[PDB]
Each structure stands twice: as C-alpha cells, then as structure tokens.
Amino acid sequence: KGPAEDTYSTSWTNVNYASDSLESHNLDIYLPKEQKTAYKAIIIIYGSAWFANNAKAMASASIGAPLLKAGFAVISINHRSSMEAIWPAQIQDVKAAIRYVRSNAAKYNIDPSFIGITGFSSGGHLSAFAGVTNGVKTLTSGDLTVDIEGSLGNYLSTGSHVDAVVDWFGPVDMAHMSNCVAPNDASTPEAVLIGKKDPREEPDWVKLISPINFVDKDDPDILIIHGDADNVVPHCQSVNLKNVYDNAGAKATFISVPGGGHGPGCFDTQYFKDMTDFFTEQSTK
Ligand SMILES: *S(=O)(=O)c1ccc(CCN)cc1
C-alpha cells in the first residue's frame, strides 16, 4: 500500500485537509529518502472516472516513487466521489488540498515556492482543471455558475494556485468524448459527475467540467502524456488540449506513447523521466 518503503524518509498518512471527518478529504504526504532541509512539492491524484473517494494509495504506488527519487515531496489526495457530491465538489476538494499544503508547508518540511500537480485519467482532468483556474473563483456558462475555489476547510486565505501540471491521459474535452466528436449519453461517468444528466442535453454543464475551455496564455506550463492505443479515454482528448494550448499562446508539451494503453506502456521509466524532468525544469524556471 502506497510507495515503496525505501523511497521516502518521512510519511504522514490520512491527514485531513478540510478540517472535517471525511476520508474523502484525507491526503498522504511523503518526503524523499534523500534528506534535505525542505522539499518542493507535487500533488498527485488517482484516476477513477471520478467515482473513487479513497484511492490515494493507488496513485502513490503508481507514480509516487519516481517523484520521490527526483527529490520532490509527494502529496496524494482523496476527493469526493461523483456519486456522493456532483461537480464542482471534486475541484473544490483539490483546491482545499492545495491550500492545506501551501499553508502548512513548513510543518511538513515542504518548500511552498513550487507546488506542481499531476494525475491520471480523471486525476489528470482535475490536475488540468486546477492549472486553468489559478486565481479563478467561479466559472459561468449560460445561466449556470459553478464555484471552483470553494469554501472548504480552514485555510481559505491561502492561495490555491499550482505552478506546473502533468496530465496523464485525462478526459478534458467532454463535448468530444463519444467517437471523439460528441458528448456521451446519460450512462457515462461524466453524466454522473453533472448530476446524472444527459451530457448531450447539457452544453453548459459539459463546458464547465471541461478544462480545455478555459486555457489562457498565462496558465502554468503543462506536460500531456497519452497512449495512442488508449481504449478508455481517447488520444484525441490530449491532441485537442495541446492544440488549444498552442492556439492560446500557452506552453504545452505533448508526448504520445506508441502502443500505450490507459496506463500500460505509459507508466514506465521513460515517461516517468519525462514527468520528473519536466517538474525539475519547472521547479527552477
Ligand atoms: S479515467 O480512468 O479516470 C476515466 C475513465 C473513463 C471515463 C468516462 C468518459 N466517458 C472518464 C475518466
């Protein structure tokens, strides 16, 4: 459970970041084995089609070790299930976790001058969504307004911005999920996220769950990694995100994994190195 014991010198597990009693608002913190005065931080988020509220250990086991070996503190967070709270609960959870880490950095030997964020599938969606809403309190489409920043926890005065994003095959363009050209029907995970409505009938909801719509020239840099044989979230999603970053004047690096699946082929030394090199380069810029 979690990252290999020899990858970290210090661990805090099941730290609640929302000042409540919900496991969906817990996180785990790991500091690298290589001891140092303070550590730049990476927040990681599991994928689960937004359904899981307790899988932070899976994320740590999946991509925690390379980050620790690269010298970063790793914070793996839970978020609430789409089945217990609809959008924007999940991004409000992420924002609250970010505020908790930034505010409490000193207590955990964390250097708050760099906080990156990364996740796979729905965790990549949440990571990208944080990276397109630095400094953004609310978003509106038509008559619908969602509170992105939220009011969860006891660190509301702390900033919730992230400095860099790594998006592992995240669903980010739900207007173009079905056959890469249309919204999915009410049977699908994004339908649950928006309250079990039919995405094909809810253009405002679909816009407000899709971070591709809010990319701006001033966004933090992003690294996008997607397998060209992903049979769960289509490659077109990351192609589209890169095109939007390119056309918005923002900075995106897109790495396509040949033969890569929804994880398989992607979680290997080469692309872990791409992620840790990216975060390391960003940590200095
Ligand atoms: S990812 O594994 O978290 C993921 C998988 C499947 C979906 C459904 C999109 N129609 C979303 C995210």
Residue numbers in the entry: 8 to 292
Quoted passage from the original study:
BD-FAE, a previously unknown protein encoded in a metagenomic PUL from beaver droppings belongs to the functionally diverse α/β-hydrolase superfamily. We demonstrated that BD-FAE removes feruloyl and acetyl groups from simple model substrates, acetyl groups from birchwood glucuronoxylan, and feruloyl groups from highly substituted AcFaXOS from corn fiber. The His-tag was not visible and the N-terminal tail showed weaker electron density than other residues of the protein, most likely due to its flexible protruding nature. Overall, the BD-FAE crystal structure adopted a typical α/β-hydrolase fold, which was consistent with the above mentioned BLASTp results. The active center contained the conserved catalytic triad of Ser128, Asp237 and His269 and the oxyanion hole was composed of NH-groups of Gly53 and Ser128.
The final model of the truncated form was refined to 1.85 Å resolution and contained residues from Met8 to Lys292. Surprisingly, also in the crystal of the truncated form, higher-order oligomers were observed indicating that N-terminal deletion was not sufficient for disrupting this assembly. Surprisingly, the crystal structure of an N-terminal truncated form of BD-FAE (∆Met1-Pro7) adopted a similar spiral shaped polymer. The interaction surface area of sequential molecules in the truncated form, however, was determined to be 764 Å2, which is 28% smaller compared to BD-FAE (1055 Å2). In the crystal structure of the truncated form, the serine protease inhibitor AEBSF (4-(2-aminoethyl)benzenesulfonyl fluoride) of the lysis buffer covalently bound to the active site’s Ser128. The phenolic ring in bound AEBS moiety resembled the binding of ferulic acid and tetrahedral sulfonyl of Ser-AEBS mimicked the enzyme–substrate–intermediate during carboxylic acid binding at Ser128. Based on that observed complex structure, Araf substituted with a 5-O linked feruloyl residue (Fa-Araf), a common substituent of xylans, was successfully docked into the active site of BD-FAE. The amino acid residues that bound Fa-Araf in BD-FAE were similar to those binding the AEBS moiety, and were in a long α-helical loop after the β5 strand. A stabilizing disulfide bond between Cys186 and Cys242 prevented extensive movement of that loop. The hydroxyl group of ferulic acid bound in BD-FAE to Glu197 in a bidentate way.
